[PDB]
Write a protein that binds this ligand. Structure first.
Ligand code: YL5
Ligand code: YL5
Ligand code: YL5
Ligand code: YL5
Ligand code: YL5
Ligand code: YL5
Lengths: 341, 341
C-alpha cells in the first residue's frame, strides 16, 4: 500500500536523475560520446526491478520526518538517495552477472551479454558506482548529513564486496563441507542484508537527523535479522516457489549454491543421504536436480522452513518491541509485511 | 633524488597498510577467509611498480608543510594517502587487464590470469577500490581535510572511468577516422592525467590546508599539461624506446591503439599512405607492425616528437611561472624533472 503510493513519483524521478548525470556541458564537448554510453547503461540496468530498496528510503523518510519539513526539496533528496540505493544495486548486479556467467536478469539479457558490450560492462559497473557520489554531491553537498551518507554508501559497498568474496571462496568445486550454517549466515549478512535492509533505513535516518551510533546499532540489529530471513525465504522459493507468484525460475541446485536448503539438508542427512546429494548437486541433467528436490521433500525441509518462518516472525516482533524506540515501529512493521507476505 | 630519499619509508609503510586492512577482529571470525583473500590481492597488485604517484604525495607534503608540522603522525598520514593513490591505480589496472585481455603487467602474470582467479578479479578490483576509503577513515577521519580527500578520490575515479569509456568507444573495429587529435587529448586528460598528475599533488595540498578552488585550478592547469606530455612520451617510447631503458616491450600498433603516433601519422599522411597503415595497423604478423614503424620513420615522426617535446617543456615552464604561486615551484619542477628525463 504505502509503497504503491510512493512508486509513481519515485519512478518519475529517474528521468531527472538521468538529465543531471548526463548533463553534457558546452565546455566539455568531447566526453559526449562517453556520456551517451553512460545514459544507455543507466537506462538498461537501473530500471526494470521492483525498486523496493530505493523505495524504502522514501517511505522511511515520510515516517521519520515531521510533515511540516517534507518540502519539495527534501522529498526530491529522498527520491534521489533512494535512487542511489538502486544504483548501488545495479553496480553489484552488472558485475555479479559477469562473474557468475549469468544469461538473464529481470528477464532481459544481462548487459554484459549484449553484443558490443562484453567485459566493457566492468567499466560500466564502475560508472554506476560513481553515479551514486555524483548524485549525493549534486543534491546533498550542503546538507549536514552529507558525509554521513557518503560513509554509509562506501561502507555498504565494502560489506557487500567482502560478502561477495566469501561467497566466491565458498563455491570455487563441489565441496559441501564448506557449506556450514555459520558460513551461510555470514555470507547473507555481508553480501545481501547490510545493503538490502540496513542501508535504506539508515539513509533515511541520517536524512532525518538521526545520526546516533546506538540508534543505528538498534536499527541494524532488527534489519540484519530481516535480511537473513528474506534471503532464506528466497532460497526456499527458488525451489518450491511457484514461478507465477515469484517471477523467477530457480536454478540454485544446478549452480551448486550455498543455499539455505543445501545447508539444512547436510545438518540432517544420514551418511547415505550425503552421497545421493554429493551425486546430484550441480548436474544440468534435470533428473539430477529432481532427485535433490525429492530428497529435500523426504527430509521434510518445506516444513523445517515453515517452522523457521514462524520462529523468525516471533523474533522479529521481539526485536521491534525492544529496539525500534525511538523510531516509529511502523518503519520496521511496514518492511516485515513486505517480506512475511 | 628527492624520491629515492622517500622510497624506503614509503615501501616499508605498506606492511602496516596491510596489517590494518587485514586486521581480523575476534568478534568477526567468519570473514577471515575473505580477509585472507584481500591480503593476497593487495600483496599481488599494489606492489611491484615504481610508486611514482603515491610517492609524489609524500614529496609534495614535505615541500608544502612547515617542517615544524611534519610530526610522525602527519608523515604517516602522508604515506597512507600516497598508498591510497597506489591502490586507486591498482584497482584500475586489475580491471583494465581483464578488459583488454592483457597477459602480463609489471612482468608478472596479470592477476585475472592466475589459475583460480579469473573474473573473480572483478570483485578483487572493487575491494582495492574500497580499501582507499577504509584507509582514509582509519587514518584521517578526524582531520579537517577528510571530506576533501574523499571527494578528491571519488572525483578521480569518476574521471578515469569516464576516460576509460571514451577509450573503449574509440577502439571497439579499425576505424581510424575515430582517431582525432581532439579525441586523443580528451582520452589522455580523463583517463590518465587527472589521477596520475593532479590527484597526488591535490591530495598533498589538501593535507597542508590548501583547499582553495583557484589554487587547485592553477595546480590543475599545470598538472594536466604534464600528464598530456607524459602519455605522449609513453606512446612514443612504446615504439622507439629501448626496452632496456623503458622496461616495457611495446605492442601499441598490434593492439590498434589510439596512440599519439597513429594520430600524427593520419594528420600528415597522403591518401596513399592512409592505405598502407589501414593495411598494417593491428596484424600480429611482425612485417605488418614493421611496415608501420618504417612509415612512422618515413613521416619524420621521431623528430615531430622531439619538436613536441621542446615545445612542451617551454610551455610547462611558462605555466609554472604563471600558476605555481603561492606553491613552491619546486613542487612542479621536481615532477617535470621526473618526466622530461
Ligand atoms: C505522518 C507523520 C510523519 C511523521 C511525524 C512526525 C515526525 C516527528 C519527528 N521527527 C524528527 C526526526 C526524528 C527524530 C527522532 C526519532 C524519530 F522517529 C524521528 P524531524 O526530522 O524533526 O521531523 N520529531 C518530532 N515529532 C514528529 S511527528 C508525524 C506524522
Ligand atoms: C528493503 C526491502 C524491502 C522489500 C524487498 C523485497 C520485496 C519483494 C517482494 N515482495 C512481495 C511479496 C513477496 C516477498 C518475498 C518473496 C516473494 F516472492 C514475494 P509484495 O509483498 O507483493 O511487495 N517480492 C519479490 N521480491 C521482493 S524484494 C527487498 C528489500
Ligand atoms: C507485519 C506483518 C507481518 C506479516 C503479516 C502477515 C503475513 C501473512 C502470511 N504470510 C506468509 C505465511 C506465513 C506463515 C507462518 C508465519 C508467517 F509469519 C507467515 P505467505 O502468505 O506464505 O507469504 N500469510 C497469511 N497471513 C499473513 S499476515 C502481516 C503483517
Ligand atoms: C623544507 C621546507 C619545507 C616547507 C617549508 C615551509 C612551509 C611553509 C608554509 N606552509 C603551510 C601550507 C602552505 C600554505 C600555502 C602555500 C604553501 F606552499 C604551503 P603549513 O601547512 O602551515 O606548513 N607556510 C608558511 N611557511 C612555510 S615554510 C620550509 C622548508
Ligand atoms: C606523478 C608522476 C610522477 C612520475 C611518473 C613516472 C615516472 C616514470 C619514470 N621515470 C624515469 C625516467 C623516465 C620517465 C619517463 C619514461 C621513461 F622511460 C623513463 P626516472 O627519471 O629515472 O625516475 N620511468 C618510468 N615510468 C615512470 S611513471 C608518473 C607520475
Ligand atoms: C626540471 C627539469 C626538466 C628537464 C631537465 C632535463 C632534461 C634533460 C634531457 N631530457 C630528455 C631530452 C630532451 C630533449 C629536448 C628537450 C627536453 F626538455 C628534453 P631525455 O634524456 O631524452 O629523457 N636530456 C638531456 N638533459 C636534460 S636536463 C632538467 C630539469
Amino acid at each position: 500500500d504505502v509503497y504503491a503510493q510512493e512508486k509513481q513519483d519515485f519512478v518519475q524521478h529517474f528521468s531527472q536523475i538521468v538529465r543531471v548525470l548526463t548533463e553534457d556541458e558546452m565546455g566539455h564537448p568531447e566526453i559526449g560520446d562517453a556520456i551517451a554510453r553512460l545514459k544507455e547503461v543507466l537506462e538498461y540496468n537501473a530500471i526494470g526491478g521492483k525498486y523496493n530498496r530505493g523505495l524504502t528510503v522514501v517511505v522511511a523518510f515520510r515516517e521519520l520526518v515531521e510533515p511540516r519539513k517534507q518540502d519539495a526539496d527534501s522529498l526530491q533528496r529522498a527520491w534521489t538517495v533512494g535512487w542511489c540505493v538502486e544504483l548501488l544495486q545495479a553496480f553489484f548486479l552488472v558485475a555479479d552477472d559477469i562473474m557468475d556467467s549469468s544469461l538473464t536478469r529481470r528477464g532481459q539479457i544481462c548487459w554484459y551479454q549484449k553484443p558490443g558490450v562484453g567485459l566493457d560492462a566492468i567499466n560500466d559497473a564502475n560508472l554506476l558506482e560513481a553515479c551514486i557520489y555524483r548524485l549525493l554531491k549534486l543534491y546533498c553537498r550542503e546538507q549536514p548529513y552529507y558525509l554521513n551518507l557518503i560513509e554509509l554508501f562506501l561502507q555498504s559497498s565494502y560489506q557487500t564486496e567482502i560478502g561477495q568474496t566469501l561467497d566466491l571462496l565458498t563455491a570455487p568445486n563441489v565441496d559441501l563441507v564448506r557449506f556450514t550454517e555459520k558460513r551461510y549466515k555470514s555470507i547473507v549478512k555481508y553480501k545481501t542484508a547490510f545493503y538490502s535492509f540496513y542501508l535504506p533505513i539508515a539513509a533515511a535516518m541520517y536524512m532525518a537527523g538521526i545520526d546516533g551510533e546506538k540508534e543505528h546499532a538498534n536499527a541494524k540489529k532488527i534489519l540484519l535479522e530481516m535480511g537473513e530471513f528474506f534471503q532464506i525465504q528466497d532460497d526456499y522459493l527458488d525451489l518450491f516457489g511457484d514461478p507465477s507468484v515469484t517471477g523467477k525460475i530457480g536454478t540454485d541446485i544446478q549452480d551448486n549454491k550455498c543455499s539455505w536448503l543445501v545447508v539444512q539438508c547436510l545438518q540432517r542427512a544420514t551418511p547415505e543421504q550425503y552421497q545421493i546429494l554429493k551425486e546430484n548437486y550441480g548436474q544440468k541433467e534435470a533428473e539430477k536436480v529432481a532427485r535433490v528436490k525429492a530428497l529435500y521433500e523426504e527430509l521434510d525441509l518445506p516444513a523445517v522452513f515453515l517452522q523457521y518462518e514462524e520462529d523468525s516472525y516471533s523474533h522479529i516482533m521481539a526485536l521491534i518491541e525492544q529496539y525500534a524506540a525511538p523510531l516509529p515501529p511502523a518503519v520496521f512493521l511496514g518492511l516485515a509485511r513486505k517480506i512475511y507476505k
